[PDB]
Every structure is written in C-alpha cells, then in structure tokens.
Nucleic acid binder design. Structure first.
Ligand SMILES: [Mg+2]
Ligand SMILES: [Mg+2]
Ligand SMILES: [Mg+2]
Length: 118
RNA sequence: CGUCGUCAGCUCGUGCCGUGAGGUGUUGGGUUAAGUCCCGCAACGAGCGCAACCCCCGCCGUUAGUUGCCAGCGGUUCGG
C-alpha cells in the first residue's frame, strides 16, 4: 500500500549526475536514468518514520525546507497542517545558526502586523 | 577650516567561509543624482553617508492691513 504507490512516478531520476556515495540505494541504469531500489527505500522510510513518530509527539518540531519550482507549494500546503514551520520561498542564509538574529525579523513582521491593523 | 568632494562611499552586530590576514553582507545583471530600489543570492539586518525633515525662489488659499491701487459720486495745494 506503500510501494504500490511509490512505484508510480516516485522513483527513478537524474542520469549521469550522481553523487556516488548514494550508490547503496541505486538499483540499475535504464534509459540512462539511475533507477532506485524500492525495498531499501521503504525500509529506510520506516527508519525515518520511526524517528518522526517519536520526535513529532515529543513536542518536537519539523522544519520543512523546499526551494525548487517542483516542490514549492506542495511543501507550503502540507507544512502548515501540523504547526510545523516551513520555507517555501528562498530559504535564507542562516535561519538556524543565526536564529537569534532572524528572530528580530520575525518581530519586525509582528510589529508590522501591528501596523497593518493600525 | 580648506581639501579628496555633495564624491557614493565607510563600516558594524550576528551568521557563514577561510589556519590566517580577510572576505561575505556591499558581488551579479537592472536602475537612478546616489550603497536609490527591487530580483536573485551565506547572508539577515543595522549605523554614519545619500535622499528627505530646514530655508529661499516658484503657484494658490486663510488672517491682517498708516505699503498698495480711480471702482465709486467727488474734492482737487489740482498732487497716491
Ligand atoms: Mg565588515
Ligand atoms: Mg574557524
Ligand atoms: Mg544606503
């Protein structure tokens, strides 16, 4: 019910542009495309999802980062529905390490939403 | 105080990179008088600069008329 759908379009990408440390999961090469194996894919999906199901109800927050044209609005839609923050548009330089500084930009957003209804 | 020159610049906080000096921000294309602004961006902002806030000169209005003008019967030293 997982790989029945994951075998839809959700596997098989970039030809001859490959980071070869990813070759654990890389299955074959047909029409140039490095097709990715689905078995280790789904077990690695469980390895992620066990951690997500732990640290998602432990008060832990997920930060959904996606910048390409392909993954913009389907990150923006599915990111706001668990309270989890996202970056739909260009994710800036140091939102995380410089978080205490970009908190000032969030507060300027709040003190500008004060100036909207003003 | 003159000067580079009213020239568009010089920086900082924090983050990143770099052993380090130091970058980055401030590069790039566009744009203006301008580091002016926006689009991308390891940058996000901020400070002094620029601009604007000041004043004159421009037009119009309100108030005010011992300057000002004939519109007015009309004096008339016959002259604002
Ligand atoms: Mg500096
Ligand atoms: Mg270091
Ligand atoms: Mg400036």
């Amino acid at each position: 019910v997982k790989e029945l759908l994951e075998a839809g379009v959700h596997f098989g990408h970039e030809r001859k542009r490959w980071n070869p440390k990813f070759a654990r999961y890389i299955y074959a090469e047909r029409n140039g495309i490095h097709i990715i194996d689905l078995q280790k894919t789904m077990e690695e999906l469980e390895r992620t999802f066990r951690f997500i199901e732990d640290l998602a109800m432990r008060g832990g927050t997920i930060l959904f980062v996606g910048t390409k044209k392909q993954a913009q609005d389907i990150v923006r839609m599915e990111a706001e529905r668990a309270g989890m923050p996202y970056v739909n548009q260009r994710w800036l330089g140091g939102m995380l390490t410089n978080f205490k500084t970009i908190s000032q930009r969030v507060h300027r957003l709040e003190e500008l939403e004060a100036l909207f209804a003003s």
